[PDB]
Amino acid sequence: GSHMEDFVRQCFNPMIVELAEKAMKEYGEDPKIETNKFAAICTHLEVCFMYSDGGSKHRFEIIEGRDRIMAWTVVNSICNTTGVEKPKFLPDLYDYKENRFIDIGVTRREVHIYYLEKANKIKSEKTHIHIFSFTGEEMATKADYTLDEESRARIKTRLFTIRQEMASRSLWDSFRQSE
Numbered sequence: 001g002s003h004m005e006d007f008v009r010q011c012f013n014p015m016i017v018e019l020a021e022k023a024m025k026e027y028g029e030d031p032k033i034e035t036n037k038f039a040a041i042c043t044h045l046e047v048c049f050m051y052s053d054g055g056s057k058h059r060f061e062i063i064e065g066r067d068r069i070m071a072w073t074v075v076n077s078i079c080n081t082t083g084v085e086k087p088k089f090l091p092d093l094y095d096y097k098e099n100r101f102i103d104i105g106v107t108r109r110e111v112h113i114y115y116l117e118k119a120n121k122i123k124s125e126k127t128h129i130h131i132f133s134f135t136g137e138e139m140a141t142k143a144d145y146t147l148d149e150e151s152r153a154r155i156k157t158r159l160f161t162i163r164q165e166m167a168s169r170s171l172w173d174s175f176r177q178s179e
């Protein structure tokens with residue numbers, strides 16, 4: 001019973017805690033032991049949700065959060081109706097306005113290093129990449145940040161609040177080094 005686990009459950013809403021637990025069990029991980037990974041997946045899920053709430057009413061199709069079979073099912077329907085290339089790895093959203101997939105990243109390091117790592121792993125030249133850091137930095141493909149400044153600023157504010165809450169509980173140092 002770690003202090004980080006009880007922080008995660010009181011920091012994020014139950015629906016995000018619920019979806020993070022299922023995703024962790026789907027890949028053979030337990031939130032009780034790998035607690036830094038538990039906090040990271042919750043954080044990434046909330047950012048994806050806030051991101052999709054950034055645009056118009058039905059601009060974004062949410063891929064993250066679904067189980068693997070249904071996520072690929074929605075990816076196939078999106079590809080087989082818009083003509084966009086089928087990515088090698090599952091993205092997080094699909095932008096119906098810009099007609100592209102998005103993989104959102106949240107990192108505790110330099111946005112530069114995580115982008116180059118995500119681009120190499122995703123191996124999908126068409127998938128748009130948007131990186132957020134816990135320090136307020138962001139990096140996106142072709143400098144195209146999709147949403148307006150205020151929607152992104154709310155995400156950055158929430159990320160820094162998560163950092164402060166962890167630091168006030170002496171959980172940030174273990175969280176920052178765990179990446």
Ligand SMILES: O=C(NCCS(=O)(=O)c1ccccc1)c1nc([C@@H]2CCCN2C(=O)c2c(Cl)cncc2Cl)[nH]c(=O)c1O
Pocket residue numbers: 023040041044045064089090091092103104105106121122
């Ligand atoms: O969607 C993802 N994974 C499933 C589809 S994948 O095809 O396996 C896939 C694998 C890698 C990258 C993208 C998709 C995904 N994963 C990651 C990282 C790296 C791999 C493990 N990992 C996590 O456990 C994780 C984290 Cl750290 C934060 N938030 C969610 C998750 Cl799962 N980073 C994401 O940005 C992300 O989108």
Ligand SMILES: [Mn+2]
Pocket residue numbers: 064090091092
């Ligand atoms: Mn994802």
Ligand SMILES: [Mn+2]
Pocket residue numbers: 044092103104105
């Ligand atoms: Mn992602």
